[PDB]
């Protein structure tokens, strides 16, 4: 039952709020990439714009026919909705999972804990149980509180801690048999090599993994989109795919930071002209065992 997975924060911002960030162009370019292909399961984050996200999901439906709805959009299509699911917030949670293998159960949980700008988001996690070779494996995808310059120091870190405890509490209460692996992945917004990183491993109840490829997932030094948004940005390693430490481990789990880039694409607005050559301001991660 072990898996090859990808997790990618696709930066599919509202096309109303941000009409010119190439959302649709990138949904196509992502669908045409090599990194999204030839995996078992893909976790998306920041699939916020309904049209652009729905198009991305359709662009990968042939290879990954079993798909969750996007977190926080509605109660339809889910076996269970939990957490602080609100009908009244402006934005869905932007998390979805697609699979080559049948999804047997799918649950969305909107985080009870938050701030901020993320107050107006059904942010949270999506749980799936998937059947591969007659046996089960479990994948949770998530996207936690960002480092907000308005929410406290301090507070963003405490928000992430509680949100991670929501995930690990859910895992415990689900009583998943320990002979089945539970992957937990996405943009966890904790930087590698920091004191908070040790906290994340405890709060999520996960072992660390081996790492490959690039040394950052949000990188203004080499990513054209990240470069624009924060030119003076410190690269960080924020996206991960882990497994619960009390359940069956993969053979030897690796997270590889993938730096594949699409052909250059432009935004003419309108005003300024700009060219970019990335899928998102984050780099995807590929997880597997060799």
Short mmCIF file of C-alpha atoms in Angstrom, two decimals:
data_model
loop_
_atom_site.label_atom_id
_atom_site.label_comp_id
_atom_site.label_asym_id
_atom_site.label_seq_id
_atom_site.Cartn_x
_atom_site.Cartn_y
_atom_site.Cartn_z
CA UNK A 1 0.00 0.00 0.00
CA UNK A 2 2.75 2.53 -0.05
CA UNK A 3 2.25 5.56 -2.24
CA UNK A 4 3.91 8.12 -4.53
CA UNK A 5 2.37 11.45 -3.70
CA UNK A 6 2.70 15.10 -4.66
CA UNK A 7 1.59 18.05 -2.58
CA UNK A 8 1.43 21.48 -4.20
CA UNK A 9 0.22 24.89 -3.09
CA UNK A 10 -0.94 26.08 -6.52
CA UNK A 11 -1.58 29.75 -5.70
CA UNK A 12 -5.03 29.82 -7.37
CA UNK A 13 -6.10 33.11 -5.88
CA UNK A 14 -9.54 34.65 -6.52
CA UNK A 15 -9.76 35.91 -10.09
CA UNK A 16 -12.10 38.65 -8.79
CA UNK A 17 -9.63 39.90 -6.19
CA UNK A 18 -6.58 39.16 -8.40
CA UNK A 19 -7.82 39.08 -12.01
CA UNK A 20 -4.35 38.96 -13.55
CA UNK A 21 -2.31 36.25 -11.83
CA UNK A 22 -2.57 33.77 -14.73
CA UNK A 23 -4.79 31.36 -12.75
CA UNK A 24 -6.38 29.75 -15.79
CA UNK A 25 -3.13 29.67 -17.77
CA UNK A 26 -1.42 27.94 -14.84
CA UNK A 27 -4.23 25.41 -14.30
CA UNK A 28 -3.45 24.25 -17.84
CA UNK A 29 0.32 24.38 -17.42
CA UNK A 30 0.04 22.40 -14.16
CA UNK A 31 -2.09 19.80 -15.97
CA UNK A 32 0.65 19.55 -18.66
CA UNK A 33 3.57 19.24 -16.21
CA UNK A 34 5.57 16.08 -15.53
CA UNK A 35 5.60 16.42 -11.74
CA UNK A 36 1.77 16.09 -11.38
CA UNK A 37 1.80 12.90 -13.48
CA UNK A 38 2.71 9.29 -12.56
CA UNK A 39 1.81 9.57 -8.86
CA UNK A 40 -0.87 7.76 -6.88
CA UNK A 41 -2.25 10.76 -4.99
CA UNK A 42 -2.02 14.52 -5.26
CA UNK A 43 -2.82 17.08 -2.56
CA UNK A 44 -3.59 20.62 -3.69
CA UNK A 45 -3.53 23.77 -1.54
CA UNK A 46 -4.75 27.27 -2.37
CA UNK A 47 -7.21 26.02 -4.96
CA UNK A 48 -9.32 29.09 -4.09
CA UNK A 49 -10.72 30.44 -7.31
CA UNK A 50 -13.68 28.17 -8.11
CA UNK A 51 -13.38 28.26 -11.92
CA UNK A 52 -9.57 28.01 -12.15
CA UNK A 53 -9.51 25.25 -9.51
CA UNK A 54 -12.30 23.30 -11.13
CA UNK A 55 -10.34 23.50 -14.37
CA UNK A 56 -7.13 22.27 -12.72
CA UNK A 57 -9.10 19.37 -11.20
CA UNK A 58 -10.59 18.53 -14.61
CA UNK A 59 -7.10 18.73 -16.21
CA UNK A 60 -5.94 15.87 -13.97
CA UNK A 61 -9.19 13.85 -13.83
CA UNK A 62 -8.15 11.35 -16.49
CA UNK A 63 -5.17 10.20 -14.47
CA UNK A 64 -6.71 10.86 -11.07
CA UNK A 65 -10.44 9.99 -11.52
CA UNK A 66 -11.25 9.84 -7.80
CA UNK A 67 -11.43 13.41 -6.43
CA UNK A 68 -12.64 15.19 -3.31
CA UNK A 69 -14.54 18.46 -3.50
CA UNK A 70 -12.53 21.50 -2.43
CA UNK A 71 -12.50 21.98 1.32
CA UNK A 72 -15.14 24.41 2.62
CA UNK A 73 -17.04 24.99 -0.57
CA UNK A 74 -20.22 23.13 0.45
CA UNK A 75 -21.44 20.12 2.45
CA UNK A 76 -22.17 18.22 -0.76
CA UNK A 77 -19.94 15.34 -1.86
CA UNK A 78 -18.54 14.57 1.59
CA UNK A 79 -19.11 11.64 3.93
CA UNK A 80 -18.77 14.07 6.86
CA UNK A 81 -18.27 17.78 7.41
CA UNK A 82 -16.79 18.87 10.72
CA UNK A 83 -14.92 21.72 12.43
CA UNK A 84 -16.01 25.33 12.07
CA UNK A 85 -17.68 24.92 8.70
CA UNK A 86 -19.34 28.25 7.90
CA UNK A 87 -21.70 28.99 4.99
CA UNK A 88 -20.98 32.69 5.38
CA UNK A 89 -17.19 33.05 4.80
CA UNK A 90 -15.95 34.48 1.48
CA UNK A 91 -13.39 31.85 0.52
CA UNK A 92 -13.22 28.07 0.60
CA UNK A 93 -10.28 26.33 2.34
CA UNK A 94 -8.55 25.62 -0.98
CA UNK A 95 -7.56 21.99 -0.16
CA UNK A 96 -8.47 19.04 -2.41
CA UNK A 97 -7.17 15.48 -2.92
CA UNK A 98 -7.17 13.46 -6.19
CA UNK A 99 -6.26 9.81 -6.57
CA UNK A 100 -5.61 7.14 -9.16
CA UNK A 101 -7.18 4.68 -6.68
CA UNK A 102 -10.74 4.64 -5.35
CA UNK A 103 -11.53 6.96 -2.49
CA UNK A 104 -13.57 5.00 -0.01
CA UNK A 105 -14.26 7.78 2.53
CA UNK A 106 -13.77 11.55 2.46
CA UNK A 107 -14.16 13.97 5.32
CA UNK A 108 -13.57 17.72 5.52
CA UNK A 109 -12.66 19.55 8.68
CA UNK A 110 -12.59 23.33 8.84
CA UNK A 111 -10.12 24.42 11.61
CA UNK A 112 -11.70 25.84 14.77
CA UNK A 113 -8.50 27.84 15.52
CA UNK A 114 -7.39 30.91 13.58
CA UNK A 115 -6.99 34.69 13.07
CA UNK A 116 -6.78 37.06 11.01
CA UNK A 117 -6.98 37.23 7.26
CA UNK A 118 -7.57 33.47 7.45
CA UNK A 119 -10.70 34.10 9.55
CA UNK A 120 -12.58 34.50 6.28
CA UNK A 121 -11.47 31.05 5.07
CA UNK A 122 -12.84 27.56 5.60
CA UNK A 123 -9.14 26.55 6.06
CA UNK A 124 -8.59 23.11 7.47
CA UNK A 125 -7.83 19.59 6.31
CA UNK A 126 -9.29 16.89 4.01
CA UNK A 127 -9.14 13.21 5.04
CA UNK A 128 -9.34 10.36 2.53
CA UNK A 129 -9.14 6.59 2.87
CA UNK A 130 -8.03 5.06 -0.39
CA UNK A 131 -8.02 1.40 -1.51
CA UNK A 132 -4.90 0.14 -3.29
CA UNK A 133 -4.48 -3.60 -3.98
CA UNK A 134 -7.50 -4.49 -1.76
CA UNK A 135 -5.92 -2.77 1.26
CA UNK A 136 -6.34 0.68 2.77
CA UNK A 137 -4.12 3.73 3.12
CA UNK A 138 -5.06 7.18 4.42
CA UNK A 139 -4.10 10.64 3.18
CA UNK A 140 -4.77 13.91 4.98
CA UNK A 141 -4.04 17.13 3.11
CA UNK A 142 -3.92 20.52 4.85
CA UNK A 143 -2.80 24.13 4.69
CA UNK A 144 -2.22 25.83 8.06
CA UNK A 145 -2.03 29.47 9.27
CA UNK A 146 0.47 31.54 7.26
CA UNK A 147 3.14 33.73 8.87
CA UNK A 148 0.88 36.80 9.10
CA UNK A 149 2.45 40.23 9.68
CA UNK A 150 -0.80 41.47 11.26
CA UNK A 151 -1.76 38.52 13.48
CA UNK A 152 0.69 38.36 16.40
CA UNK A 153 4.24 37.14 16.70
CA UNK A 154 3.75 34.67 18.26
CA UNK A 155 0.08 34.19 17.51
CA UNK A 156 0.58 32.61 14.03
CA UNK A 157 2.79 30.00 15.65
CA UNK A 158 0.19 29.30 18.37
CA UNK A 159 -2.53 29.13 15.68
CA UNK A 160 -0.50 26.53 13.69
CA UNK A 161 0.11 24.48 16.86
CA UNK A 162 -3.60 24.18 17.65
CA UNK A 163 -4.47 23.49 14.01
CA UNK A 164 -1.94 20.66 13.95
CA UNK A 165 -3.40 19.32 17.18
CA UNK A 166 -6.82 19.32 15.43
CA UNK A 167 -5.30 16.98 12.81
CA UNK A 168 -3.53 14.66 15.25
CA UNK A 169 -6.68 14.57 17.47
CA UNK A 170 -8.78 13.61 14.43
CA UNK A 171 -6.28 10.83 13.60
CA UNK A 172 -6.43 9.43 17.16
CA UNK A 173 -10.22 9.60 17.37
CA UNK A 174 -10.59 7.88 14.04
CA UNK A 175 -9.02 4.71 15.45
CA UNK A 176 -7.22 3.81 12.21
CA UNK A 177 -5.60 0.41 12.56
CA UNK A 178 -1.86 0.78 13.05
CA UNK A 179 -1.07 -1.58 10.24
CA UNK A 180 -2.28 1.08 7.77
CA UNK A 181 -0.24 4.18 6.89
CA UNK A 182 -1.59 7.69 7.50
CA UNK A 183 0.09 10.39 5.33
CA UNK A 184 -0.31 14.02 6.43
CA UNK A 185 0.86 16.64 3.96
CA UNK A 186 0.60 20.11 2.52
CA UNK A 187 1.79 23.64 3.19
CA UNK A 188 2.37 23.43 6.92
CA UNK A 189 3.95 26.92 7.14
CA UNK A 190 6.69 25.81 9.55
CA UNK A 191 10.27 26.45 8.32
CA UNK A 192 12.76 23.57 8.45
CA UNK A 193 15.69 23.92 10.88
CA UNK A 194 13.75 26.12 13.38
CA UNK A 195 12.58 25.52 16.96
CA UNK A 196 9.00 25.47 15.62
CA UNK A 197 9.91 22.49 13.37
CA UNK A 198 10.38 20.25 16.45
CA UNK A 199 6.99 21.44 17.72
CA UNK A 200 5.34 20.48 14.39
CA UNK A 201 6.67 16.88 14.62
CA UNK A 202 5.19 16.58 18.10
CA UNK A 203 1.89 18.34 17.39
CA UNK A 204 1.30 16.41 14.18
CA UNK A 205 2.59 13.14 15.75
CA UNK A 206 4.93 12.46 12.81
CA UNK A 207 8.51 11.24 12.19
CA UNK A 208 10.89 13.46 10.16
CA UNK A 209 11.75 12.18 6.64
CA UNK A 210 14.75 12.15 4.26
CA UNK A 211 14.99 15.15 1.90
CA UNK A 212 15.91 15.55 -1.76
CA UNK A 213 16.17 18.16 -4.51
CA UNK A 214 15.81 21.85 -3.78
CA UNK A 215 16.36 23.25 -0.20
CA UNK A 216 13.34 25.58 -0.08
CA UNK A 217 9.69 25.42 -1.21
CA UNK A 218 8.96 29.16 -1.15
CA UNK A 219 11.99 30.80 -2.74
CA UNK A 220 12.14 34.47 -3.96
CA UNK A 221 15.70 33.81 -5.11
CA UNK A 222 14.77 31.26 -7.84
CA UNK A 223 10.97 31.38 -8.19
CA UNK A 224 9.69 34.14 -10.48
CA UNK A 225 6.37 34.53 -8.74
CA UNK A 226 7.87 34.50 -5.23
CA UNK A 227 10.52 36.94 -6.57
CA UNK A 228 7.80 39.48 -7.51
CA UNK A 229 5.82 39.27 -4.25
CA UNK A 230 8.77 39.49 -1.84
CA UNK A 231 12.07 40.31 -3.68
CA UNK A 232 13.96 40.53 -0.37
CA UNK A 233 12.46 37.24 0.82
CA UNK A 234 14.27 34.65 2.90
CA UNK A 235 13.67 31.27 1.15
CA UNK A 236 11.89 28.80 3.42
CA UNK A 237 10.93 25.10 3.39
CA UNK A 238 7.26 25.05 4.29
CA UNK A 239 5.64 22.13 2.40
CA UNK A 240 5.94 18.51 3.58
CA UNK A 241 4.44 15.07 3.38
CA UNK A 242 4.85 13.11 6.63
CA UNK A 243 3.22 9.97 8.13
CA UNK A 244 1.75 9.43 11.57
CA UNK A 245 4.47 7.88 13.79
CA UNK A 246 2.13 5.35 15.46
CA UNK A 247 0.97 3.73 12.22
CA UNK A 248 2.73 1.67 9.54
CA UNK A 249 5.68 3.55 8.01
CA UNK A 250 6.61 3.60 4.34
CA UNK A 251 9.83 1.75 3.48
CA UNK A 252 11.93 4.96 3.66
CA UNK A 253 9.96 8.11 3.08
CA UNK A 254 11.60 10.89 1.03
CA UNK A 255 10.33 14.40 0.35
CA UNK A 256 11.78 15.77 -2.88
CA UNK A 257 11.38 19.49 -3.65
CA UNK A 258 10.66 19.67 -7.39
CA UNK A 259 11.83 22.75 -9.37
CA UNK A 260 10.19 21.96 -12.70
CA UNK A 261 9.16 25.10 -14.55
CA UNK A 262 6.58 25.61 -17.34
CA UNK A 263 7.28 27.41 -20.58
CA UNK A 264 7.28 31.19 -19.98
CA UNK A 265 3.79 32.68 -19.82
CA UNK A 266 2.65 36.28 -19.68
CA UNK A 267 0.16 38.57 -18.09
CA UNK A 268 -0.76 41.72 -20.03
CA UNK A 269 -2.21 44.13 -17.50
CA UNK A 270 -2.44 46.90 -18.49
CA UNK A 271 -0.42 49.02 -17.31
CA UNK A 272 2.51 46.65 -16.69
CA UNK A 273 3.60 43.69 -18.75
CA UNK A 274 5.17 40.71 -16.96
CA UNK A 275 6.50 37.26 -17.82
CA UNK A 276 6.74 34.39 -15.38
CA UNK A 277 7.98 30.85 -15.60
CA UNK A 278 6.62 29.03 -12.55
CA UNK A 279 3.41 27.04 -11.74
CA UNK A 280 2.97 28.76 -8.37
CA UNK A 281 4.94 30.79 -5.81
CA UNK A 282 5.59 27.44 -4.07
CA UNK A 283 7.49 24.49 -5.44
CA UNK A 284 5.67 21.10 -5.32
CA UNK A 285 6.97 18.26 -3.23
CA UNK A 286 7.08 14.64 -4.42
CA UNK A 287 7.00 11.94 -1.68
CA UNK A 288 7.87 8.28 -2.14
CA UNK A 289 10.18 5.52 -0.98
CA UNK A 290 13.05 4.30 -3.18
#
